[PDB]
Amino acid sequence: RVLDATQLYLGEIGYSPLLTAEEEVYFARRALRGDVASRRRMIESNLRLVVKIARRYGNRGLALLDLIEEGNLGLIRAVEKFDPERGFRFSTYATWWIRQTIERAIMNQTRTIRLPIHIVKELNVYLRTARELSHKLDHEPSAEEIAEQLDKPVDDVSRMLRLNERITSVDTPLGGDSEKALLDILADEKENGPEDTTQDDDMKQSIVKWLFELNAKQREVLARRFGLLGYEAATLEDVGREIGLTRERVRQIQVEGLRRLREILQTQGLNIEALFL
Amino acid sequence: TPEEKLLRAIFGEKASDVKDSSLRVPNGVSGTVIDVQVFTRDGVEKDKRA
RNA sequence: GAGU
DNA sequence: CCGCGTCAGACTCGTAGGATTATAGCATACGTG
DNA sequence: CACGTATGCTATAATGTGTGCAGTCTGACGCGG
């Protein structure tokens, strides 16, 4: 049968009767009182207005159905805050709430990276200003030309235009040819290299061998303090407390062990110096 | 890594704030630089070469 | 655009 | 049967980066140094 | 208190969508009337 979401929804809204002013006022008095039925009937009678407005605001923000739902949410706020006693029509009041809610929704949801309202609205004034500038300059405006117009920092303008940089999909295939996407080219920069992984093995293992060259006392002090062969980087007090009370002696043996390693390096450092790239 | 902690303690050589992203000749291409062109934004202090 |  | 739908349709190489729009204006509200 | 982010309200009437494309390929194998 008829399986479009949109068509179904529009049909359902169609089958609710439109209200006159006096009717709206009567209903709405009872709605503020909390009639339930009254609220429901006013909402449903005025859904068609929502769709008329969402039709306008759609275009490129979001799906029509998405706009319709957000619009409905605005309409509900309007029904909650309507004043029947004031002579102004409901549709006039509701229009404000519906437009408001739709716009706020499209300021948030539209952007993959959620941009705060303040930033978004700032950025928009930069845009509208750019448009006026471009009309009269014949040329689309520079960052500094827009900044000179606003009497503001170029850094501000630049940062905002950077945020406006819209996303590219990683899956989008490249070159007008359904050959291969961005993912196919894009490296993992963090993940080195069997080269790099094997070099860390080599490094760590060369340090073990070097540590064993030194005295049993120096090697143990270095191992425990660095957290190298131990588990935790034991502080001066921890290492001293487990061995030799003198916290000061840990510093002494440690620094002594580093200087013996310097000797090994000046002798056999011919391997160590090549660790500098 | 604890190893580099120990090593940088030994040599001092505390590693600096700046890295290295210099543009270099792609490997096995080789030739003569015949022209250079520089583009700076409107506000940033220009290079001496520019 | 290059061999199939 | 007829008709409407879903499913397949060679292998490596190449080139090059890249597109669009627009969301008011102001006052209060919530969380961090 | 301030700075960054959020939530909020506005009152002439206005009350069922459309829009941007798709271009029709092909021989086979199943699935409700």
Cβ contact A60 with chain D strand, < 7 A: yes
Strand partners, A181: A173
Q: Which residues contact A49 (CB under 8 A, 6 or more apart)?
A: A75, A91, A94, A95, A98
Q: Based on the domain organization, do A69 and A128 belong to the same domain?
A: no
Torsion of CA A85, A86, A87, A93, to 10 degrees: -120
Q: Based on the domain organization, do A27 and A109 belong to the same domain?
A: yes
Cβ contact A159 with chain E strand, < 7 A: no
Closest nucleotide to residue A56 (Cα to C1')? E17
B1 contacts on A by Cβ (under 8 Å): 200, 204
Inter-chain contact B2–A226, Cβ cutoff 8 Å? Answer: yes
Number of domains observed in the structure of chain A: 3
Last residue of a domain, one of A114, A138, A168: A114
Estimate the crossing angle of helix A64-80 against helix A5-14, to 10 degrees.
Answer: 30
The experimental resolution of this structure, in angstroms, equals 4.2
- Quick one: which residue's CA is nearest to E20's C1'? A59
Contact A132, A139 (CB under 8 A): no
Q: HSE (CB half, 13 Å, CA atoms) of A54?
A: 26
Inter-chain contact B9–A228, Cβ cutoff 8 Å? Answer: no
How many angstroms away from the CA of A128 is the closest CA of chain B? 22
Inter-chain contact B3–A144, Cβ cutoff 8 Å? Answer: no
Q: Based on the domain organization, do A232 and A249 belong to the same domain?
A: yes
Strand partners, A185: none
* Residue of A222, A202, A214, A223 lying closest to A271 (CA atoms): A202
Bases on strand D under 7 Å from any protein CB: 13-26
The DSSP letter of residue B44 is S
What tokens were used for A49?
Answer: 């207005």
Burial B15-37 (b: 16+ CB within 10 A, else e): eeeeeeeeeeeeeeeeeeeeeee
Q: Where are the alpha helices (DSSP H) in A173-215?
A: 194-213
Last residue of a domain, one of A145, A176, A191: A191
Q: Based on the domain organization, do A176 and A196 belong to the same domain?
A: no
Q: Based on the domain organization, do A98 and A85 belong to the same domain?
A: yes
Reduced to 3 states (helix: H, G, I; strand: E, B; else coil), residue A173 is strand
How distant, in Å, are the alpha carbons of A2, A48, A113, A257 from that of A215? 87, 88, 57, 8
Q: Which domain holds residue A274?
A: 192-277
CA A15 remoteness from chain centre: 42
Last residue of a domain, one of A64, A83, A114: A114
- Best residue of A211, A229, A254, A258 to probe chain B, by most B CBs closer than 10 Å: A258
Hey, CA dihedral for A145, A151, A153, A156, is it positive or negative?
negative
Inter-chain contact A228–B6, Cβ cutoff 8 Å? Answer: yes
Contact A109, A62 (CB under 8 A): yes
Which of residues 209 to 238 on A have a Cβ less than 7 angstroms from any strand E atom?
none
- What does chain B come to in residues? 50
Q: Based on the domain organization, do A99 and A126 belong to the same domain?
A: no
Reduced to 3 states (helix: H, G, I; strand: E, B; else coil), residue A181 is strand
Q: Based on the domain organization, do A109 and A5 belong to the same domain?
A: yes
Query: Tokens 């979001």 correspond to what residue?
Result: A62
The DSSP letter of residue A257 is H
Q: Based on the domain organization, do A92 and A119 belong to the same domain?
A: no
